[PDB]
Amino acid sequence: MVNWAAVVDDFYQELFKAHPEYQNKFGFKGVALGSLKGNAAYKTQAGKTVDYINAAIGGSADAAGLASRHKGRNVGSAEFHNAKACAAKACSAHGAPDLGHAIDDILSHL
Numbered sequence: 001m002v003n004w005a006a007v008v009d010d011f012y013q014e015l016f017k018a019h020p021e022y023q024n025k026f027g028f029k030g031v032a033l034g035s036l037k038g039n040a041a042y043k044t045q046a047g048k049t050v051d052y053i054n055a056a057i058g059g060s061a062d063a064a065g066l067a068s069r070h071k072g073r074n075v076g077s078a079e080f081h082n083a084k085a086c087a088a089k090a091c092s093a094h095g096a097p098d099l100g101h102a103i104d105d106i107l108s109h110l
């Protein structure tokens, strides 16, 4: 199976390398990037992200509900366009399909 857990790890590395301040919104605020895998808050969040990717691919994802929840953290369209670029890099690094269509579905509600 596509190793979405590894893709997601590379996604967050890309995302917080380019936009370190985004990490302040998470329960692993302030944690060194090379230590995220040892942080309990990160382990839970990355698992949720992996679950959402599998739901989007499996056809059950609630993109409107995910967008609304991100709006609820003052995360919007600009951040998701940046996420699109970071996910494209993470997917390419693993020879995984791109997640641009799933991220566009979220963007359609932002």
Ligand code: HEM
Binding pocket: 022, 023, 025, 026, 027, 045, 048, 049, 052, 053, 069, 070, 073, 075, 079, 080, 083, 084, 087, 103
């Ligand atoms: C590929 C794009 C992204 C996906 C698939 C995604 C996925 C998720 C999921 C599945 C959750 C958990 C929602 C739930 O528990 O109901 C979540 C929470 C969250 N996301 Fe994202 N996200 C993305 C990008 C971003 C970006 C760019 C930021 C900007 C900071 C961000 C900020 C947050 C925050 C702050 C939370 C709440 C974390 C907490 O409860 O501690 N997300 N996201």
